[PDB]
């Protein structure tokens, strides 16, 4: 009865100890397969031996001297260099001319590395965010946190929240960046509000050349009134998907036949026609 709950709660205790034991053994076996002086011998030495060689590795690593430790300034800075999606750019505190630059700028915004070096920083920086920048690394201090825009790459702006401490003059600072078809958009009349970049391969056109115009111009005379009338139906068809087929024009001046399917998307509350989305397929 209650004595049967005794050894059943004692069963819970025995299983707690079971988990404890296998967990210690797991920490132990992982430590074994981790430290090289124990990660090789397949006849894993006895638990005491691996504890001893672990004492060895720990202290030999912790030989530094003259949170105290548990990460080096080198270690943390290295990781933030290859983690923060940012970059390092040492500059000057007397003039501003770039001192050191990292290759970590190289893939983040696809910027060249040593182009900053050889130039000053105000060259390719908005002069409007130079004003107090100049008067931030100035002398007569405080922990730096001045928000600053930054140039992107130019071969094949963004704000970096650079926090740190000024130095010898020069300025050292870092921080994570503070940051075949084509589908288009029309209005209730038929003017391009948006068009995908795939037009260069379906009509031989960059998107801006059709943006700001109505499609009906580029429709063949025999198909113009058709296409107009069609869209007039599709509008009041309450977004029921619908298709039209018209000869789209081209700067190649080749009359190419094609099909376009369209329907209306309505903000469910307003129920007002917010935009027209037109799928297009060049054949």
């Amino acid at each position: 009865s209650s004595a049967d709950k005794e050894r059943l709660a004692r069963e819970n205790h025995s299983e707690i100890e079971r988990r404890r034991r296998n967990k210690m053994t797991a920490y132990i076996t992982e430590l074994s397969d981790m430290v090289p002086t124990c990660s090789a011998l397949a006849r894993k030495p006895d638990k005491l031996t691996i504890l001893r060689m672990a004492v060895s590795h720990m202290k030999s690593l912790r030989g530094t001297g003259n949170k105290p430790s548990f990460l080096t300034d080198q270690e943390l800075k290295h990781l933030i260099l290859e983690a923060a999606d940012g970059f390092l750019f040492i500059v000057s505190c007397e003039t501003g001319r770039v001192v050191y630059v990292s290759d970590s700028v190289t893939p983040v915004l696809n910027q060249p590395q040593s182009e900053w070096f050889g130039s000053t920083l105000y060259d390719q920086v908005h002069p409007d965010d130079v004003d107090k920048l100049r008067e931030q690394l100035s002398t007569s201090g405080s922990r730096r946190s001045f928000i600053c825009r930054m140039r992107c790459g130019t071969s094949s702006f963004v704000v970096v929240h650079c926090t740190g401490y000024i130095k010898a003059f020069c300025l050292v600072a870092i921080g994570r960046l503070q940051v075949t078809e084509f589908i288009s958009r029309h209005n209730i009349e038929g003017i391009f509000t948006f068009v995908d970049h795939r037009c260069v391969a379906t009509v031989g056109y960059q998107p801006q050349e059709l943006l700001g115009k109505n499609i009906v111009e580029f429709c063949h005379p025999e198909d113009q009134q058709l296409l107009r009338d069609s869209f007039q139906q599709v509008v009041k068809l309450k977004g029921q998907v619908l298709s039209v087929m018209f000869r789209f024009r081209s700067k190649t001046r080749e009359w190419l036949w094609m099909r376009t399917s369209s329907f209306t998307f309505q903000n469910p509350y307003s129920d007002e026609i917010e935009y027209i989305i037109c799928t297009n397929t060049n054949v």
Binding site: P68, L76, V159, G164
Partner: protein, 306 residues
């Protein structure tokens, strides 16, 4: 009758782990308030990170340009906690700043368990594992949402990070390292005050750098007029849910937005309803291409169970 010898081995283990404890280069302070299993897991984490780091040289992080105290300043100036671990689940390092964002000290957290699946609520485990299941996109980013067991809900935390190369090693073989910055999301952001027409009342000024559009230029403009024509349907069903009910209803969204200068900048938006008629407040966060891919995977997965 192993009373004599088994005692000797037990106490030998205790002595070597005592050596481990006082040699554990943590603070003199918190260590006396520790447990043995705790000390063991902690020492394993240190040895792992140590052999990882020592197997490389200080190449592209030149030293001396910064001081260690100034390094502590830098990490004190971060909006979250740093985390580096293996895809097998094995932790490497956690900056103590997590306290100012999670309460429970790092030493009080890595104690009971030595894995990511020990500092993470059950629900998201598989999902986490899912975004961890793919060991590809090398030196490319990944972004996922998950919770961390709080100091008793557990606050949702965004995690963005990069994988790196495992150095020559039989253990690290089939186990690259993943470093990541993490931050509690519910308060590099633009806040949106939206009404029931998904229009634009007030935006955070910072959108001026995110989109090149000054706040006044967006006053009374349908935000639908900035949506990519493809994830439109996702946003539409989410507006449907945010409208059909009455209460503190929450919403998530992965979207793409255009720009003044042209181009595309993916955004991750979250919404919570203040009142049944009151304004709908929303927090947005910018991401990268794959930093929307992984979110799309996690999102669709969260919808598969339904």
């Amino acid at each position: 009758s192993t009373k004599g010898a088994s005692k000797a081995r037990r106490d030998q283990i205790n002595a070597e782990i005592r050596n481990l404890k006082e040699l554990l280069p943590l603070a003199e302070a918190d260590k006396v308030r520790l447990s043995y299993l705790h000390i063991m897991s902690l020492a394993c984490i240190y040895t792992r990170k140590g052999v990882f780091f020592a197997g490389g040289t200080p190449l592209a992080g030149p030293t001396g340009l910064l001081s260690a105290q100034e390094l502590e300043d830098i990490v004190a100036a971060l909006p979250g906690f740093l985390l580096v671990f293996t895809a097998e689940g094995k932790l490497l390092y956690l900056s103590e700043s997590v306290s100012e964002h999670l309460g429970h000290s790092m030493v009080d957290l890595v104690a009971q368990g030595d894995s990511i699946y020990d500092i993470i609520d059950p629900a998201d485990h598989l999902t986490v594992r899912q975004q961890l299941t793919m060991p590809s996109a090398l030196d490319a980013d990944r972004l996922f949402r998950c919770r961390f067991n709080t100091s008793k809900g557990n606050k949702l935390v965004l995690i963005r990070g990069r994988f790196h190369a495992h150095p020559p090693g039989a253990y690290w073989a089939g186990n690259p390292v993943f470093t990541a910055f993490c931050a509690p999301l519910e308060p590099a952001m633009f806040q949106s005050r939206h009404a029931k027409d998904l229009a634009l009342l007030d935006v955070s000024e910072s959108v001026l750098i995110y989109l090149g559009f000054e706040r006044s230029e967006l006053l009374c403009k349908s935000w639908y007029g900035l949506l990519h024509p493809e994830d439109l349907a996702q946003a539409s069903s989410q507006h449907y849910r945010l409208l059909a009910e009455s209460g503190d209803i929450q919403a998530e969204m992965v979207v793409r937005l255009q720009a003044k200068h042209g181009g595309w900048t993916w955004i991750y938006c979250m919404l919570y309803s203040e009142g049944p008629e009151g304004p709908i407040t929303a927090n947005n966060y910018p991401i990268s291409d794959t930093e929307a891919w992984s979110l799309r995977q996690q999102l669709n997965s969260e919808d598969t169970q339904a």
